Amino acid sequence: SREQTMENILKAAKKKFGERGYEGTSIQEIAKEAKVNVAMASYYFNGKENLYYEVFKKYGLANELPNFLEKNQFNPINALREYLTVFTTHIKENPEIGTLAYEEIIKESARLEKIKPYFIGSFEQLKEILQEGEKQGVFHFFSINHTIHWITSIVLFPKFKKFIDGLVPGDLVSRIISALTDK
Amino acid sequence: SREQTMENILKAAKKKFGERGYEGTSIQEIAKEAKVNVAMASYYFNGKENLYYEVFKKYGLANLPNFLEKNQFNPINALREYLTVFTTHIKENPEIGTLAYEEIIKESARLEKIKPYFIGSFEQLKEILQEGEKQGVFHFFSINHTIHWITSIVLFPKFKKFIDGLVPSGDLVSRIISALTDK
């Protein structure tokens, strides 16, 4: 019942913050969405700023990711496919993470710093998988920086990709992999 | 005068919309920023929604010339001018970029009506790229992939910087061109 209520409030926080952003969302709005009074929301989460962080802590990218390269016997295509599947599926089921993150990147706020780990943590692996695929002659790209840039844009901002798709004539993961294995 | 009052209102809207987005900004706040009567502001632009579109009409990419034609159909030269012009415009009107986002995500009724202040640049981009590929000076997976990552840097320079901060100066345009000319 404690956990249920805490979960209810975090689900509501994610929903409302995702709709209106940090500033446009109130603790009252959230509490109302969660069917609890404001005092109940303060008790568990102690104010707007910390609730926002707990939203990223709970629904952000899971911090305990296996090593995808080892998990996939150092087959980089297989490692990248699994990595990207894990990560794009997460953003599909928790889209607010993507849209809130990619927002705060523009406001360059103090929130950004505390938020980073919960959508950024796995980029190190993404670098390793790519560099090992390049080393194996299985991936081809101009630079690692350029490639992480467009791959993480798709991961965090899949709707921009849909938007460009509407203007210029799939499966996201397969499309990332085809762009990399083009020789 | 009518014209002057309208300039002031648009300057205000741009500023205020940029800060808080469509939803978190009221016509009251813009009018107050412009030091004008709310109901006048509202009437002159026939409402908040139309005012918002006029912000894009005024400050967007309505402006451009045929960069291919202006560059003697040298695609590299045309793309460089194109990129320089576009990035400079986003630098000088950052709200256009950041507001395009809040809206590419909300997939709003508003998106459809703001698109026309980017579609035009994007087809010119497409033409430059295809002309370059045809002349054998550009090489890429697909035009859709290419336009996706380029327009990503252009409309959302701050994410590009954010990734630059996580993955190891340099001219942005050169970097785009180098990624296109890479054999």
Nearest to residue A152, comparing CAs of A102, A109, A94?
A102
Resolution in A: 2.3
**Rounded to whole angstroms, how far apart are CA atoms A29 and A39?**
13
Contact A77, A133 (CB under 8 A): yes
Distance of alpha carbon B181 from alpha carbon B71, whole angstroms = 18
Phi, psi of A114 (to 5 degrees): -70, -30
Whole-Å CA distances, B51 to B10, B110, B155:
8, 12, 21
Residues of B with CB under 8 A from a CB of A: 20-21, 23-24, 98, 101-102, 104-105, 107, 119, 122, 126, 141-145, 147-149, 151-153, 156, 158-160, 162-164, 166-168, 175, 178-179, 182
Which residues in chain A belong to E strands, given as ranges? none
Nearest-neighbour CA in chain A from B19: distance (Å): 9
Minimal CA–CA distance to A63: which of A153, A124, A113?
A124
Neighbours of B75 (CB within 10 A): 24
Sketch out chain A's domains with CATH numbers: 1-47 (1.10.10.60), 48-183 (1.10.357.10)
Residue B114: phi, psi to the nearest 5? -90, -30
- Listed in sequence order, the residues at least 6 apart from A44 whose beta carbon sits closer than 8 Å to its beta carbon are A5, A6, A9
Alpha-helical segments (H) within chain B: 2-20, 27-33, 38-44, 48-59, 67-70, 75-92, 94-106, 109-114, 119-134, 143-155, 157-166, 172-181
Helices and strands per DSSP (H, E), number in chain A: 13, 0
CA distance B12 to A149: 33
Instruction: Map tokens 């202040």 to a residue.
Output: B117
C-alpha distance across the termini of chain B, in Å = 58
Q: CB distance B158–A105 less than 8 Å?
A: yes
Q: Which of B59, B52, B79, B55 is nearest to B67 (CA)?
A: B79
Way the structure was solved: X-ray
Between chains, do B163 and A182 touch, taking CB under 8 Å as contact? no
**Nearest 5°: phi and psi at A46?**
50, 55
Instruction: Kindly state the helix (H) or strand (E) to which residue A15 belongs, with its residue range.
Output: helix A2-20
Tell which residue, B147, B158, B169, has the closest CA to residue B83.
Answer: B147
Q: A73: which DSSP letter?
A: T
Question: Token pair of B176, please?
Answer: 């785009």
d(CA A45, CA A64): 24
- Cα of B128 to nearest chain A Cα, Å: 14
Burial class of B152 by CB neighbour count within 10 A (0 to 12, 13 to 18, 19+): buried
Consecutive H or E run containing A10: helix A2-20
**Distance of alpha carbon B106 from alpha carbon B108, whole angstroms:** 5
Q: How far apart are CA B163 and CA A115, in angstroms?
A: 15
A104 Cβ contact list (under 8 Å, min separation 6):
A22, A111, A112, A115
Q: Report d(CA A17, CA A95) in Å as an integer.
A: 11
Four-CA torsion A139, A175, A127, A54, nearest 10 degrees: -170
| Chain B contact set for A148 (CB, 8 A) | 163, 166-167
Q: How many residues are given for chain B?
A: 183
A168–B126 CB contact, under 8 Å? yes
* A&B contacts, CB < 8 Å: 94
Cβ–Cβ below 8 Å for A106 and B107:
no
Torsion of CA A88, A91, A92, A96, to 10 degrees: -160
For tokens 């409309």, the residue is B155
The closest CB to that of B160, out of A149, A157, A169, belongs to A149
Q: Tell me which DSSP letter residue B117 carries.
A: G
Cβ–Cβ < 8 Å for B41, B30: yes
* Of A48, A56, A45, nearest in space to A27 by CA: A48
CB atoms within 10 A of CB A64: 5
Residue B170 CB partners (closer than 8 Å, separation 6+): none
